[PDB]
Amino acid sequence: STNPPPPETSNPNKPKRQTNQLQYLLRVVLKTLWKHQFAWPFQQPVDAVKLNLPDYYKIIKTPMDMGTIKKRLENNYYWNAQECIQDFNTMFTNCYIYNKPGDDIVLMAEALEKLFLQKINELPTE
Amino acid sequence: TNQLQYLLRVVLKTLWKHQFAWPFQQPVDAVKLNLPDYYKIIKTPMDMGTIKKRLENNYYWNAQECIQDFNTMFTNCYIYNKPGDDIVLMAEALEKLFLQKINELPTE
Amino acid sequence: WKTIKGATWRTKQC
């Protein structure tokens, strides 16, 4: 019962770009979330082997983590801020879908998402 | 038409294979699923299994009537379930992929 | 343990 390959962080067929908003997402939005006390379960892809969860990747088929998002931002993977924001939402929604609304991992994800929505409201104009 | 086959051979087929599609592939059995007041609240149940069978038996007048059933399927989930719920988030993921398929709908 | 529309699995809590 192994872990699948992590999501890609580069693609020669995908148009690379670098805007004012994407620079803000890497140095402001993702920066404060990465330094949060509840960030450690989300900085890497879900390790279903160490967690003894054989059913995680049987349910979640599009995993996402801050480590993937951070590496994608560093490599100019996205075309605009909307693409990067959707990866964040994917990371959050996967946690809310797989876990119970009262679990600690959900209470940690909800805290990160609220801080995420605070910094996104101050996203600069293109 | 050509759009009613695109909705069946492409749209309905790419949504049926989605990771969160299984709650929507069959009609809701509120008695089995232990969903009280579901039929009291949902007055027009809809699912991809019924939509698939209607596209195969030429039930829809045009493509917009079939799209109406997809919206009805999504709206029923947004009406009966609380926002932010797991089942709602799964329904929003299917609606997003569904709307991308509608942008690429061929012309009549 | 979480249950959604007839499918059950073990969460991180358990």
Author numbering:
A (entry chain A): 42 to 167
B (entry chain C): 60 to 167
C (entry chain E): 1 to 14
Share the article's original sentences.
To assess the contributions made by each AcK to BD binding, we synthesized peptides in which each of these three residues was mutated in turn to Ala. Mutation of AcK7 reduced the affinity of 3.1B for all three BD1 domains by fourfold to ∼2 to 5 nM, whereas mutation of AcK5 to Ala reduced binding ∼80-fold (KD 29 to 35 nM).
